[PDB]
Protein backbone atom coordinates (compact mmCIF):
# COMPACT_ATOMS: atom_id res chain seq x y z
CA UNK A 1 0.00 0.00 0.00
CA UNK A 2 2.62 2.52 1.15
CA UNK A 3 5.94 0.64 1.22
CA UNK A 4 6.58 -0.56 -2.35
CA UNK A 5 9.31 -3.23 -2.63
CA UNK A 6 11.47 -2.36 -5.67
CA UNK A 7 14.54 -4.59 -5.22
CA UNK A 8 16.49 -7.10 -3.12
CA UNK A 9 19.33 -5.51 -1.13
CA UNK A 10 22.70 -7.30 -0.99
CA UNK A 11 23.99 -8.19 2.49
CA UNK A 12 18.27 -14.35 4.63
CA UNK A 13 17.81 -10.87 3.13
CA UNK A 14 15.10 -8.19 3.13
CA UNK A 15 13.50 -6.12 0.35
CA UNK A 16 14.35 -2.48 -0.37
CA UNK A 17 11.14 -0.50 0.21
CA UNK A 18 10.13 2.80 -1.40
CA UNK A 19 7.85 4.76 0.95
CA UNK A 20 4.94 6.54 -0.76
CA UNK A 21 5.31 10.36 -0.75
CA UNK A 22 8.01 10.34 1.97
CA UNK A 23 10.80 9.13 -0.36
CA UNK A 24 9.97 11.88 -2.90
CA UNK A 25 11.16 12.00 -6.50
CA UNK A 26 13.13 9.12 -8.05
CA UNK A 27 16.30 9.54 -10.14
CA UNK A 28 17.35 6.56 -12.25
CA UNK A 29 20.99 6.70 -13.42
CA UNK A 30 23.40 4.44 -15.34
CA UNK A 31 25.06 3.57 -18.65
CA UNK A 32 23.24 2.09 -21.66
CA UNK A 33 21.97 -1.48 -21.30
CA UNK A 34 22.04 -1.63 -17.48
CA UNK A 35 18.33 -1.49 -16.57
CA UNK A 36 17.17 2.14 -16.49
CA UNK A 37 13.92 1.58 -18.41
CA UNK A 38 13.23 -1.69 -16.55
CA UNK A 39 13.48 0.18 -13.23
CA UNK A 40 11.09 2.78 -14.68
CA UNK A 41 8.67 0.03 -15.77
CA UNK A 42 8.91 -1.79 -12.41
CA UNK A 43 8.11 1.40 -10.46
CA UNK A 44 5.11 2.49 -12.55
CA UNK A 45 3.56 -1.01 -12.53
CA UNK A 46 4.09 -1.39 -8.76
CA UNK A 47 2.24 1.85 -7.96
CA UNK A 48 -0.48 1.00 -10.50
CA UNK A 49 -1.25 -2.25 -8.65
CA UNK A 50 -1.96 -0.43 -5.37
CA UNK A 51 -3.70 2.82 -6.40
CA UNK A 52 -6.60 3.48 -8.79
CA UNK A 53 -6.53 5.33 -12.14
CA UNK A 54 -8.62 8.03 -10.42
CA UNK A 55 -6.05 8.21 -7.58
CA UNK A 56 -2.87 7.96 -9.69
CA UNK A 57 -2.27 9.65 -13.07
CA UNK A 58 0.73 8.98 -15.34
CA UNK A 59 2.23 11.13 -18.11
CA UNK A 60 4.94 9.05 -19.79
CA UNK A 61 7.55 10.91 -21.86
CA UNK A 62 9.35 8.12 -23.72
CA UNK A 63 12.24 9.74 -25.61
CA UNK A 64 14.46 6.63 -25.37
CA UNK A 65 13.62 3.82 -27.79
CA UNK A 66 9.98 2.81 -27.21
CA UNK A 67 10.87 0.99 -23.96
CA UNK A 68 7.75 2.35 -22.23
CA UNK A 69 5.43 1.66 -25.20
CA UNK A 70 3.65 -1.20 -23.37
CA UNK A 71 2.73 1.16 -20.50
CA UNK A 72 0.53 3.11 -22.96
CA UNK A 73 -2.05 0.32 -22.46
CA UNK A 74 -2.37 1.09 -18.72
CA UNK A 75 -5.58 2.76 -17.46
CA UNK A 76 -3.43 4.99 -15.21
CA UNK A 77 -1.69 6.64 -18.19
CA UNK A 78 -3.36 9.89 -19.26
CA UNK A 79 -1.17 10.47 -22.32
CA UNK A 80 2.00 9.08 -23.93
CA UNK A 81 4.59 11.42 -25.47
CA UNK A 82 7.34 10.94 -28.06
CA UNK A 83 10.03 13.23 -29.51
CA UNK A 84 7.89 13.88 -32.62
CA UNK A 85 4.89 14.99 -30.52
CA UNK A 86 6.10 18.57 -29.99
CA UNK A 87 2.68 20.28 -30.11
CA UNK A 88 1.39 17.80 -27.50
CA UNK A 89 4.35 18.54 -25.19
CA UNK A 90 3.77 22.29 -25.61
CA UNK A 91 0.13 21.84 -24.53
CA UNK A 92 1.25 19.71 -21.56
CA UNK A 93 3.43 22.60 -20.34
CA UNK A 94 0.33 24.83 -20.43
CA UNK A 95 -1.74 22.08 -18.76
CA UNK A 96 0.69 21.65 -15.84
CA UNK A 97 1.04 25.42 -15.25
CA UNK A 98 -2.76 25.68 -14.95
CA UNK A 99 -3.00 22.45 -12.91
CA UNK A 100 -0.30 23.56 -10.44
CA UNK A 101 -1.77 27.07 -10.22
CA UNK A 102 -5.24 25.61 -9.60
CA UNK A 103 -3.77 23.28 -6.95
CA UNK A 104 -2.07 26.18 -5.12
CA UNK A 105 -5.44 27.99 -4.97
CA UNK A 106 -7.27 24.96 -3.55
CA UNK A 107 -4.46 24.46 -1.01
CA UNK A 108 -4.60 28.12 0.09
CA UNK A 109 -8.42 28.10 0.19
CA UNK A 110 -8.41 25.25 2.75
CA UNK A 111 -5.16 26.30 4.49
CA UNK A 112 -2.95 23.27 3.77
CA UNK A 113 0.67 22.68 2.71
CA UNK A 114 0.85 19.05 1.54
CA UNK A 115 -1.38 16.92 -0.73
CA UNK A 116 -1.77 14.34 2.07
CA UNK A 117 -3.63 16.93 4.16
CA UNK A 118 -5.82 18.25 1.32
CA UNK A 119 -7.07 14.78 0.31
CA UNK A 120 -7.72 13.86 3.96
CA UNK A 121 -9.92 16.89 4.71
CA UNK A 122 -11.47 17.37 1.25
CA UNK A 123 -14.15 14.87 0.21
CA UNK A 124 -13.28 15.34 -3.47
CA UNK A 125 -9.76 13.89 -3.82
CA UNK A 126 -7.04 15.07 -6.22
CA UNK A 127 -5.04 12.52 -8.24
CA UNK A 128 -1.30 12.01 -7.72
CA UNK A 129 0.51 12.93 -10.94
CA UNK A 130 3.78 11.13 -11.72
CA UNK A 131 5.71 12.62 -14.66
CA UNK A 132 7.73 9.69 -16.04
CA UNK A 133 10.56 10.77 -18.36
CA UNK A 134 12.71 8.19 -20.17
CA UNK A 135 16.05 9.54 -21.48
CA UNK A 136 16.74 12.97 -19.94
CA UNK A 137 19.88 13.53 -22.06
CA UNK A 138 17.82 14.24 -25.20
CA UNK A 139 15.69 16.75 -23.25
CA UNK A 140 18.80 18.44 -21.81
CA UNK A 141 20.25 19.14 -25.28
CA UNK A 142 17.34 19.52 -27.72
CA UNK A 143 14.53 20.80 -25.44
CA UNK A 144 15.68 23.61 -23.10
CA UNK A 145 12.12 25.01 -22.77
CA UNK A 146 10.82 21.67 -21.46
CA UNK A 147 13.92 21.31 -19.24
CA UNK A 148 13.03 24.56 -17.44
CA UNK A 149 9.59 23.14 -16.62
CA UNK A 150 11.02 19.82 -15.37
CA UNK A 151 13.03 21.71 -12.72
CA UNK A 152 9.81 23.44 -11.60
CA UNK A 153 7.91 20.12 -11.42
CA UNK A 154 10.63 18.47 -9.30
CA UNK A 155 10.97 21.44 -6.93
CA UNK A 156 7.42 22.75 -6.46
CA UNK A 157 5.30 19.77 -7.59
CA UNK A 158 6.08 17.24 -4.83
CA UNK A 159 4.23 19.31 -2.19
CA UNK A 160 1.21 19.67 -4.51
CA UNK A 161 1.10 15.90 -5.19
CA UNK A 162 3.02 15.97 -8.48
CA UNK A 163 6.05 13.65 -8.39
CA UNK A 164 8.74 13.22 -11.04
CA UNK A 165 10.71 10.21 -12.30
CA UNK A 166 13.53 10.29 -14.88
CA UNK A 167 16.32 8.19 -16.39
CA UNK A 168 19.65 9.76 -17.37
CA UNK A 169 22.77 8.36 -19.06
CA UNK A 170 24.99 11.38 -18.28
CA UNK A 171 24.62 12.97 -14.83
CA UNK A 172 27.53 15.37 -15.44
CA UNK A 173 25.57 18.32 -16.85
CA UNK A 174 22.35 18.05 -14.83
CA UNK A 175 21.67 21.18 -12.77
CA UNK A 176 22.04 20.97 -8.94
CA UNK A 177 18.46 22.23 -8.40
CA UNK A 178 17.10 19.30 -10.42
CA UNK A 179 19.58 16.86 -8.86
CA UNK A 180 18.83 17.94 -5.27
CA UNK A 181 15.05 17.65 -5.71
CA UNK A 182 15.53 14.04 -6.84
CA UNK A 183 15.15 12.62 -3.32
CA UNK A 184 15.63 8.94 -4.20
CA UNK A 185 18.52 8.00 -6.53
CA UNK A 186 18.77 4.58 -8.19
CA UNK A 187 22.36 4.38 -9.50
CA UNK A 188 23.10 1.55 -11.95
CA UNK A 189 26.59 0.75 -13.29
CA UNK A 190 28.64 3.42 -15.10
CA UNK A 191 31.52 2.98 -17.57
CA UNK A 192 33.27 6.31 -16.98
CA UNK A 193 34.93 6.87 -13.59
CA UNK A 194 34.20 10.63 -13.59
CA UNK A 195 30.46 9.92 -13.87
CA UNK A 196 30.53 7.79 -10.69
CA UNK A 197 32.41 10.44 -8.68
CA UNK A 198 29.64 13.05 -9.05
CA UNK A 199 26.98 10.62 -7.76
CA UNK A 200 28.86 10.00 -4.48
CA UNK A 201 27.58 13.33 -3.14
CA UNK A 202 28.64 15.01 0.10
CA UNK A 203 30.92 13.19 2.55
CA UNK A 204 32.79 13.97 5.81
CA UNK A 205 35.67 15.20 3.59
CA UNK A 206 33.48 18.14 2.48
CA UNK A 207 33.24 19.38 6.10
CA UNK A 208 35.63 22.29 6.72
CA UNK A 209 37.22 22.94 10.14
CA UNK A 210 34.54 25.36 11.39
CA UNK A 211 32.65 24.87 14.70
CA UNK A 212 29.04 24.20 13.62
CA UNK A 213 29.87 22.83 10.16
CA UNK A 214 28.81 19.18 9.80
CA UNK A 215 27.54 16.46 7.47
CA UNK A 216 24.15 14.97 8.40
CA UNK A 217 23.73 11.39 7.16
CA UNK A 218 20.02 10.50 7.22
CA UNK A 219 20.32 6.93 5.93
CA UNK A 220 23.05 4.71 4.46
CA UNK A 221 23.14 3.70 0.79
CA UNK A 222 22.39 0.08 -0.14
CA UNK A 223 23.51 -2.16 -3.01
CA UNK A 224 20.27 -3.46 -4.52
CA UNK A 225 19.12 -5.78 -7.30
CA UNK A 226 16.01 -4.17 -8.79
CA UNK A 227 13.16 -6.62 -9.44
CA UNK A 228 11.83 -7.18 -12.96
CA UNK A 229 8.30 -5.86 -13.64
CA UNK A 230 7.10 -9.42 -14.36
CA UNK A 231 8.54 -12.93 -13.96
CA UNK A 232 10.43 -14.46 -16.91
CA UNK A 233 13.65 -16.11 -18.09
CA UNK A 234 14.24 -13.78 -21.07
CA UNK A 235 13.21 -10.33 -22.38
CA UNK A 236 10.26 -11.69 -24.41
CA UNK A 237 8.74 -13.73 -21.56
CA UNK A 238 8.95 -10.70 -19.24
CA UNK A 239 7.42 -8.39 -21.87
CA UNK A 240 4.61 -10.93 -22.43
CA UNK A 241 3.83 -11.20 -18.69
CA UNK A 242 4.06 -7.40 -18.45
CA UNK A 243 1.26 -7.22 -21.05
CA UNK A 244 -0.74 -9.83 -19.09
CA UNK A 245 -0.18 -7.80 -15.90
CA UNK A 246 -1.80 -4.71 -17.48
CA UNK A 247 -4.74 -6.76 -18.79
CA UNK A 248 -5.53 -7.55 -15.14
CA UNK A 249 -5.30 -3.87 -14.15
CA UNK A 250 -7.71 -3.02 -16.99
CA UNK A 251 -10.14 -5.70 -15.75
CA UNK A 252 -9.80 -4.76 -12.06
CA UNK A 253 -10.19 -0.99 -12.57
CA UNK A 254 -13.14 -1.20 -14.99
CA UNK A 255 -15.71 1.04 -13.25
CA UNK A 256 -13.07 3.56 -12.10
CA UNK A 257 -13.08 6.67 -14.33
CA UNK A 258 -10.01 6.87 -16.58
CA UNK A 259 -7.81 9.99 -16.94
CA UNK A 260 -8.41 12.49 -19.75
CA UNK A 261 -5.83 12.69 -22.57
CA UNK A 262 -4.30 16.09 -23.36
CA UNK A 263 -6.88 18.04 -25.42
CA UNK A 264 -5.66 18.82 -28.96
CA UNK A 265 -7.29 20.71 -31.84
CA UNK A 266 -7.38 18.74 -35.12
CA UNK A 267 -5.89 20.34 -38.27
CA UNK A 268 -9.13 19.73 -40.20
CA UNK A 269 -12.59 19.62 -38.59
CA UNK A 270 -15.73 18.54 -40.45
CA UNK A 271 -19.33 18.79 -39.20
CA UNK A 272 -19.88 15.01 -39.39
CA UNK A 273 -16.86 14.30 -37.16
CA UNK A 274 -17.79 17.23 -34.88
CA UNK A 275 -21.33 15.90 -34.33
CA UNK A 276 -20.35 12.24 -33.81
CA UNK A 277 -17.14 12.16 -31.75
CA UNK A 278 -16.86 15.53 -29.99
CA UNK A 279 -20.50 16.56 -29.47
CA UNK A 280 -21.75 14.16 -26.78
CA UNK A 281 -24.26 16.43 -25.00
CA UNK A 282 -27.25 16.33 -27.40
CA UNK A 283 -29.43 18.47 -25.11
CA UNK A 284 -32.68 20.18 -26.11
CA UNK A 285 -32.39 23.95 -26.63
CA UNK A 286 -28.62 23.81 -27.24
CA UNK A 287 -27.00 24.52 -30.62
CA UNK A 288 -23.34 23.38 -30.73
CA UNK A 289 -21.37 25.83 -32.91
CA UNK A 290 -17.76 24.63 -32.53
CA UNK A 291 -14.90 23.49 -30.30
CA UNK A 292 -13.20 25.83 -27.83
CA UNK A 293 -9.58 26.65 -28.69
CA UNK A 294 -8.06 26.00 -25.25
CA UNK A 295 -10.20 23.29 -23.63
CA UNK A 296 -11.25 21.60 -26.91
CA UNK A 297 -14.89 21.00 -25.95
CA UNK A 298 -18.16 21.80 -27.76
CA UNK A 299 -19.36 25.38 -27.17
CA UNK A 300 -23.12 25.78 -27.68
CA UNK A 301 -25.78 28.49 -27.91
CA UNK A 302 -28.36 28.28 -25.12
CA UNK A 303 -31.60 28.95 -27.04
CA UNK A 304 -33.71 29.44 -23.89
CA UNK A 305 -31.60 32.24 -22.39
CA UNK A 306 -30.04 33.62 -25.59
CA UNK A 307 -32.53 33.01 -28.45
CA UNK A 308 -31.10 35.35 -31.12
CA UNK A 309 -27.59 35.42 -32.63
CA UNK A 310 -25.62 37.51 -35.16
CA UNK A 311 -23.07 36.17 -37.67
CA UNK A 312 -20.69 39.11 -38.13
CA UNK A 313 -17.74 39.28 -40.55
CA UNK A 314 -16.42 40.23 -43.99
CA UNK A 315 -15.82 36.69 -45.29
CA UNK A 316 -18.73 35.45 -47.43
CA UNK A 317 -17.47 31.86 -47.12
CA UNK A 318 -17.02 32.21 -43.34
CA UNK A 319 -20.53 33.56 -42.69
CA UNK A 320 -22.25 31.07 -45.01
CA UNK A 321 -20.41 28.18 -43.32
CA UNK A 322 -21.51 29.27 -39.83
CA UNK A 323 -25.13 29.43 -41.07
CA UNK A 324 -24.84 25.80 -42.26
CA UNK A 325 -23.34 24.75 -38.89
CA UNK A 326 -26.41 26.28 -37.20
CA UNK A 327 -28.82 24.80 -39.77
CA UNK A 328 -27.30 21.32 -39.35
CA UNK A 329 -27.48 21.62 -35.55
CA UNK A 330 -31.07 22.94 -35.75
CA UNK A 331 -32.09 19.84 -37.76
CA UNK A 332 -30.97 17.62 -34.85
CA UNK A 333 -33.59 19.43 -32.75
CA UNK A 334 -37.34 19.11 -33.45
CA UNK A 335 -38.24 22.52 -34.94
CA UNK A 336 -41.70 23.72 -35.97
CA UNK A 337 -40.46 25.71 -38.97
CA UNK A 338 -37.24 27.19 -40.39
CA UNK A 339 -37.49 30.24 -42.68
CA UNK A 340 -34.23 30.28 -44.64
CA UNK A 341 -33.66 33.58 -46.48
CA UNK A 342 -30.64 32.94 -48.72
CA UNK A 343 -28.42 35.66 -50.21
CA UNK A 344 -28.23 36.72 -53.87
CA UNK A 345 -25.77 33.87 -54.47
CA UNK A 346 -27.84 30.69 -54.05
CA UNK A 347 -25.35 28.85 -51.82
CA UNK A 348 -27.80 27.25 -49.38
CA UNK A 349 -30.06 25.78 -52.09
CA UNK A 350 -29.39 22.21 -50.88
CA UNK A 351 -31.27 22.84 -47.62
CA UNK A 352 -34.42 23.91 -49.51
CA UNK A 353 -35.65 20.39 -50.33
CA UNK A 354 -35.09 19.13 -46.75
CA UNK A 355 -37.98 18.76 -44.29
CA UNK A 356 -39.03 21.54 -41.88
CA UNK A 357 -37.25 24.18 -44.02
CA UNK A 358 -39.07 26.84 -46.05
CA UNK A 359 -36.64 28.23 -48.65
CA UNK A 360 -37.32 31.95 -49.11
CA UNK A 361 -36.26 34.02 -52.14
CA UNK A 362 -38.95 36.56 -53.10
CA UNK A 363 -40.84 38.99 -50.86
CA UNK A 364 -44.24 37.30 -51.29
CA UNK A 365 -42.92 33.93 -50.03
CA UNK A 366 -41.41 35.58 -46.93
CA UNK A 367 -44.80 37.11 -46.04
CA UNK A 368 -46.41 33.65 -46.29
CA UNK A 369 -43.86 32.17 -43.87
CA UNK A 370 -44.32 35.04 -41.38
CA UNK A 371 -48.08 34.31 -41.39
CA UNK A 372 -47.47 30.62 -40.63
CA UNK A 373 -44.87 31.53 -37.98
CA UNK A 374 -47.00 34.24 -36.33
CA UNK A 375 -50.05 31.94 -36.25
CA UNK A 376 -48.09 29.42 -34.14
CA UNK A 377 -46.50 32.09 -31.91
CA UNK A 378 -49.88 33.77 -31.32
CA UNK A 379 -51.22 30.44 -29.99
CA UNK A 380 -48.20 30.11 -27.67
CA UNK A 381 -48.82 33.66 -26.41
CA UNK A 382 -52.38 32.70 -25.41
CA UNK A 383 -51.18 29.60 -23.53
CA UNK A 384 -48.53 31.71 -21.76
CA UNK A 385 -50.99 34.44 -20.68
CA UNK A 386 -53.69 31.92 -19.68
CA UNK A 387 -51.11 30.08 -17.54
CA UNK A 388 -50.16 33.23 -15.60
CA UNK A 389 -53.77 34.40 -15.15
CA UNK A 390 -54.84 30.97 -13.83
CA UNK A 391 -51.80 30.64 -11.51
CA UNK A 392 -50.13 27.79 -13.41
CA UNK A 393 -46.49 27.00 -14.16
CA UNK A 394 -45.65 28.29 -17.65
CA UNK A 395 -44.17 26.00 -20.32
CA UNK A 396 -40.38 25.74 -20.11
CA UNK A 397 -39.63 25.24 -23.82
CA UNK A 398 -41.32 25.00 -27.24
CA UNK A 399 -40.34 23.71 -30.70
CA UNK A 400 -38.12 26.50 -32.11
CA UNK A 401 -39.57 28.76 -34.82
CA UNK A 402 -36.28 29.89 -36.39
CA UNK A 403 -35.74 32.67 -38.95
CA UNK A 404 -32.31 32.19 -40.56
CA UNK A 405 -30.92 34.92 -42.83
CA UNK A 406 -27.75 34.40 -44.92
CA UNK A 407 -27.56 38.09 -45.94
CA UNK A 408 -28.70 41.17 -44.00
CA UNK A 409 -28.37 43.28 -47.16
CA UNK A 410 -30.69 40.90 -49.04
CA UNK A 411 -33.26 41.10 -46.21
CA UNK A 412 -33.36 44.92 -46.38
CA UNK A 413 -33.79 44.86 -50.18
CA UNK A 414 -36.61 42.28 -50.03
CA UNK A 415 -38.59 44.14 -47.31
CA UNK A 416 -40.22 47.53 -46.72
CA UNK A 417 -40.89 49.73 -43.66
CA UNK A 418 -44.13 47.87 -42.83
CA UNK A 419 -42.68 44.35 -43.19
CA UNK A 420 -39.42 45.36 -41.46
CA UNK A 421 -41.44 46.71 -38.51
CA UNK A 422 -43.50 43.51 -38.38
CA UNK A 423 -40.41 41.32 -37.94
CA UNK A 424 -39.04 43.75 -35.32
CA UNK A 425 -42.32 43.51 -33.37
CA UNK A 426 -42.28 39.68 -33.53
CA UNK A 427 -38.85 39.73 -31.84
CA UNK A 428 -40.16 42.04 -29.09
CA UNK A 429 -43.37 40.03 -28.63
CA UNK A 430 -42.45 36.36 -29.12
CA UNK A 431 -38.79 36.14 -27.97
CA UNK A 432 -39.86 34.23 -24.83
CA UNK A 433 -42.13 31.84 -26.79
CA UNK A 434 -39.63 29.85 -28.88
CA UNK A 435 -38.94 32.42 -31.61
CA UNK A 436 -35.35 32.65 -32.89
CA UNK A 437 -33.45 34.82 -35.38
CA UNK A 438 -30.05 34.21 -37.00
CA UNK A 439 -28.83 37.08 -39.20
CA UNK A 440 -25.55 37.27 -41.14
CA UNK A 441 -23.77 40.30 -42.60
CA UNK A 442 -20.90 42.79 -42.38
CA UNK A 443 -20.26 44.70 -39.15
CA UNK A 444 -20.93 48.12 -40.71
CA UNK A 445 -24.34 46.99 -42.06
CA UNK A 446 -25.67 46.46 -38.52
CA UNK A 447 -24.26 49.82 -37.34
CA UNK A 448 -25.21 51.88 -40.41
CA UNK A 449 -28.77 50.50 -40.52
CA UNK A 450 -31.16 52.71 -38.53
CA UNK A 451 -34.37 51.15 -39.90
CA UNK A 452 -36.95 49.39 -37.69
CA UNK A 453 -35.66 45.85 -38.37
CA UNK A 454 -31.91 46.57 -38.17
CA UNK A 455 -32.40 48.66 -35.00
CA UNK A 456 -33.74 45.51 -33.30
CA UNK A 457 -30.91 43.28 -34.61
CA UNK A 458 -28.10 45.53 -33.31
CA UNK A 459 -29.36 45.06 -29.71
CA UNK A 460 -28.80 41.26 -29.79
CA UNK A 461 -26.04 40.54 -27.25
CA UNK A 462 -25.05 37.09 -28.60
CA UNK A 463 -22.98 36.60 -31.76
CA UNK A 464 -20.49 34.48 -33.70
CA UNK A 465 -17.72 36.70 -35.06
CA UNK A 466 -15.82 35.45 -38.13
CA UNK A 467 -13.68 38.60 -38.12
CA UNK A 468 -11.20 40.49 -35.92
CA UNK A 469 -12.47 42.06 -32.68
CA UNK A 470 -10.74 45.33 -33.62
CA UNK A 471 -12.55 45.43 -37.00
CA UNK A 472 -16.08 45.93 -35.60
CA UNK A 473 -17.96 48.54 -33.54
CA UNK A 474 -20.85 46.30 -32.45
CA UNK A 475 -19.49 44.45 -29.40
CA UNK A 476 -17.03 46.09 -26.98
CA UNK A 477 -14.47 43.28 -26.63
CA UNK A 478 -10.86 42.94 -25.39
CA UNK A 479 -8.16 43.06 -28.08
CA UNK A 480 -4.53 44.03 -28.75
CA UNK A 481 -2.24 45.14 -31.61
CA UNK A 482 -0.84 41.67 -32.34
CA UNK A 483 -4.18 39.96 -33.04
CA UNK A 484 -4.38 36.61 -34.85
CA UNK A 485 -5.51 36.62 -38.49
CA UNK A 486 -8.91 35.12 -39.33
CA UNK A 487 -8.15 31.81 -41.07
CA UNK A 488 -10.90 29.53 -42.45
CA UNK A 489 -12.79 27.64 -39.72
CA UNK A 490 -11.95 30.04 -36.88
CA UNK A 491 -13.88 32.75 -35.03
CA UNK A 492 -15.06 34.19 -31.71
CA UNK A 493 -18.19 33.22 -29.76
CA UNK A 494 -19.59 36.34 -28.06
CA UNK A 495 -22.24 36.04 -25.33
CA UNK A 496 -23.17 38.17 -22.29
CA UNK A 497 -20.13 40.45 -22.61
CA UNK A 498 -17.54 37.66 -22.49
CA UNK A 499 -15.98 36.00 -25.55
CA UNK A 500 -13.80 33.04 -26.56
CA UNK A 501 -11.91 31.68 -29.58
CA UNK A 502 -13.51 28.67 -31.29
CA UNK A 503 -12.83 26.23 -34.13
CA UNK A 504 -15.85 26.34 -36.46
CA UNK A 505 -16.33 23.01 -38.29
CA UNK A 506 -16.61 22.96 -42.09
CA UNK A 507 -19.95 21.74 -43.48
CA UNK A 508 -19.29 19.70 -46.64
C1 LIG B 1 13.25 -2.50 -22.26
N1 LIG B 1 14.15 -3.62 -22.04
C2 LIG B 1 13.87 -4.71 -21.26
C3 LIG B 1 12.65 -4.86 -20.58
C4 LIG B 1 12.41 -5.99 -19.80
C5 LIG B 1 13.36 -7.00 -19.68
C6 LIG B 1 14.58 -6.91 -20.33
C7 LIG B 1 14.88 -5.80 -21.12
C8 LIG B 1 16.22 -5.73 -21.82
O1 LIG B 1 16.34 -5.11 -22.86
O2 LIG B 1 17.40 -6.40 -21.27
C9 LIG B 1 18.23 -5.71 -20.32
C10 LIG B 1 18.16 -6.43 -18.99
O3 LIG B 1 17.71 -7.78 -19.13
C11 LIG B 1 17.18 -5.58 -18.19
N2 LIG B 1 17.25 -5.76 -16.71
C12 LIG B 1 17.01 -4.79 -15.81
N3 LIG B 1 17.13 -5.26 -14.54
C13 LIG B 1 17.44 -6.56 -14.62
C14 LIG B 1 17.70 -7.66 -13.66
N4 LIG B 1 17.65 -7.44 -12.32
N5 LIG B 1 17.99 -8.88 -14.16
C15 LIG B 1 18.05 -9.12 -15.48
N6 LIG B 1 17.82 -8.17 -16.41
C16 LIG B 1 17.51 -6.89 -16.05
O4 LIG B 1 17.47 -4.25 -18.60
C17 LIG B 1 17.81 -4.27 -19.99
C18 LIG B 1 18.91 -3.25 -20.29
O5 LIG B 1 18.55 -1.97 -19.78
P1 LIG B 1 17.18 -1.24 -20.22
O6 LIG B 1 17.01 -1.41 -21.71
O7 LIG B 1 16.08 -1.70 -19.30
O8 LIG B 1 17.46 0.31 -19.90
P2 LIG B 1 18.74 1.10 -20.49
O9 LIG B 1 19.14 0.50 -21.82
O10 LIG B 1 19.76 1.22 -19.39
O11 LIG B 1 18.13 2.57 -20.76
P3 LIG B 1 17.14 2.88 -22.00
O12 LIG B 1 16.27 1.65 -22.14
O13 LIG B 1 16.40 4.11 -21.54
O14 LIG B 1 18.08 3.11 -23.16
Author numbering: 968 to 978, 983 to 1479
Task: Quote the study on this structure.
The membrane-bound protein EssC is an integral component of the bacterial Type VII secretion system (T7SS), which is a determinant of virulence in important Gram-positive pathogens. The protein is predicted to consist of an intracellular repeat of forkhead-associated (FHA) domains at the N-terminus, two transmembrane helices and three P-loop-containing ATPase-type domains, D1–D3, forming the C-terminal intracellular segment. We present crystal structures of the N-terminal FHA domains (EssC-N) and a C-terminal fragment EssC-C from Geobacillus thermodenitrificans, encompassing two of the ATPase-type modules, D2 and D3. The observation of protomer contacts in the crystal structure of EssC-C together with similarity to the DNA translocase FtsK, suggests a model for a hexameric EssC assembly.
A crystal of the EssC-C–mant-ATP complex gave improved data and hence this dataset was used to finalize the structure at 2.9 Å resolution. The polypeptide is composed of two homologous P-loop ATPase-like modules or domains (D2 and D3), which are connected by a linker (Gln1225–Ser1241). ATP was included in the other since there was no clear density for this mant moiety. The adjacent residue in EssC-C D2 is Asn1106 rather than the canonical acidic residue that primes a water molecule for nucleophilic attack on the γ-phosphate. The mant group is accommodated in a hydrophobic pocket formed by Val1209 and Leu1210 on α9 and Ala1038 on α2. In D2 the corresponding polypeptide does not extend the core sheet but rather forms an extended structure which we term the ‘β9-segment’ (Ile1171–Tyr1198) that protrudes from the globular fold so that β9 (Gly1183–Lys1188) serves to extend the central β-sheet of a symmetry-related molecule D2 domain through association with β8 (Thr1155–His1159) and β10 (Thr1195–Ile1197). Despite the inclusion of excess mant-ATP in the crystallization conditions we only observe the ligand to bind the D2 domain and this is consistent with binding data that suggest a stoichiometry <1.
